[PDB]
């Protein structure tokens, strides 16, 4: 099963943005662009500027593999459990919540080749919220998920596309004071605009073949390549042999 | 299944609003457009004044795709949970919300080779308030929800 | 709006060939790792 | 399986490479002085499990 | 049964990023980047630095 995931961004910010309180010879005051004026008495105007242009790009390509017989049930499951302690005084217990991915098949030949599945499908993970708030310390995983339940029919070696979900946007503000946002060479201090662009691709795809012949080379052997390669090889030792020497008999 | 969104925006404000309070020579107080003056007896004449001129658009088309088979009931999700911590003592939960799209469909061929389905749509997201008020902390999700259950060919 | 469509043929080109020229052109493909092709040429079989 | 010969029963492949790019709008053109306003970051993962 | 988990990685980060506030006379401030002013209103600018 192939999970493809593609994101793309783009944002761009640059203007001010006014808004402040003055006290002209405790008799009058003026304020701007605001709702509160007497707990922002003592301080004064605010011209807050923003600069930013922003590119992004995220590519994430997931594939679960899993192996059964005809007319037999198979799960593949990787999930990740969080659990967390509701001080009662009864019935105290661990509560606790799962999420990840999650395959449950069930194989099965037609009369021409072609293999028909029933599949349950789940795709989730860990969306988090504003770190620098107190809600992070809290028990707050908020979960996505994303679930799929139908019937599909392969034929041996060629691939369906199960799922699918796209998403574009385009936003973009203007803001400006009424008579200072046109002038020539100092207008440029009081206008203000915004914009985004977002482009998201998920899909799911099914790929079944049969499986005959067992692996080739074996897997007591494309283990001690890996073992001698990357350093992690001890069936040199002078004390530990003489017990691995039972294991490694094959 | 297509959902588009679009939106359109203006706005404008250009003007002063006078209201304060004053005293002179501390025998005759004077105010101005206010119903409570002794709690801004030492106060002033505040002049609010405001000027902006705004516009806005956004754009939003989503998409979501689902495979299945004739007389098959099949399901798309994708949701968002929310728990929260209900301190009780004895039946403590942890209680959540859901909200996310959602399609259930139960396609069918007719006889001309049209095809009928049985619809079960929903379209959520998460509404926010106003962020410096307290209740941005606390388990307050407002969440707006879209919900359509028909039936077409 | 609802656009419903009917499936009588598998994708063209594979599954299998359209992710391999997504991890080519975006930087993420390891199929040339000397470490990683001892195991992954049991799951890239075909 | 056959007696001695192996079968692969699981597993569990993630690639991943993301790039993020930030700068000041007119100041990170600049040729010599433009590099204090710039950002840049990269990322990539391969993650192999097989039973 | 043979259970073999291998991993890879990358990063690379270089550039700044620059948000703070100031105050001009008393009279008039300016920000850069920020959203909560008054609290940060006895700070300077700061220039994050990553490499």
Known sequence: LWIVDLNKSDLERLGTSWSGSITIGDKLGVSLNQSSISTLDGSRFIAAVNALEEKKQATVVSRPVLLTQENVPAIFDNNRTFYTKLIGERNVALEHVTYGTMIRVLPR???????????????????????????????????????????????????????????????????????????????????????????????????????????????????????????????????????RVYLDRG
């Not at 099914?206 to 499986?211: L, M, R, S, T, V």
Request: charged letters at 25%; proline letters at 6%.
């Open 109 to 243: 030949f037609s009369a021409d080749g072609q293999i028909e599945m029933s599949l349950d499908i789940e795709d989730g993970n860990d969306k988090t919220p504003q770190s620098d708030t107190t809600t992070s310390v809290d028990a707050l995983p908020e979960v996505g998920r994303t679930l799929i339940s139908t019937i599909a029919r392969v034929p041996h070696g060629k691939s369906l596309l199960v799922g699918g979900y796209t998403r574009d946007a385009n936003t973009d503000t203007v803001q400006s004071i009424p008579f200072l946002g046109k002038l020539p060479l100092i207008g440029s201090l009081f206008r203000y605009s915004s914009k985004n662009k977002s482009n998201v691709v998920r899909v799911f795809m099914i790929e079944p073949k049969e499986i005959v012949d067992p692996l080739t080379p074996d897997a007591s052997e494309s283990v001690n390549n890996i073992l001698k390669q990357s350093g992690a090889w001890s069936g040199d030792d002078k004390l530990q042999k003489w017990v």
